Design a binder for this molecule. Structure first.
Ligand code: HC4
Length: 125
């Protein structure tokens, strides 16, 4: 188990050292997106929450293909403003309900340290 707490102030520095195997040891769901919303990384805890198979969703677009319930001003709209501005750090509750039992989660979106990548972190509430 990797010990990093959800919501930690310097989480992007800590997660910069992990490969996909290490990300699978986190206590919470983690998705890495490019600035178009394509999925680059998707960990085991996220798949436990959503039912998706991690290897199968890498390369898909999160907003168009995987998670249409997030294509809303309340989720996608926040992401796209962050990508446009080059800064993003926001936490909110949301319900995931596409092809699954409706599940309430806490979401933390934060710009990654390097380049044009963005984290989505998720835990149950
Ligand atoms: C709504 O369509 C949410 C879907 C969803 C959220 C997060 C995931 O990792 C996968 C699907």
């Amino acid at each position: 188990m990797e010990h990093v707490a959800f919501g930690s102030e310097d989480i992007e520095n800590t997660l910069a050292k992990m490969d996909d195997g290490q990300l699978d040891g986190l206590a919470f769901g983690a998705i890495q997106l490019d600035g178009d919303g394509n999925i680059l990384q998707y960990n085991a805890a996220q798949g436990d929450i959503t039912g998706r198979d991690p290897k199968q969703v890498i390369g898909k677009n999160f907003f168009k293909d995987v998670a249409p319930c997030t294509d809303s001003p309340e989720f996608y709209g926040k992401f796209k403003e962050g990508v446009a501005s080059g800064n993003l750090n926001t936490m909110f509750e949301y319900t995931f309900d596409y092809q699954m039992t409706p599940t309430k989660v806490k979401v933390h979106m934060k710009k990654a340290l390097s380049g044009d990548s963005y984290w989505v972190f998720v835990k149950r509430v």
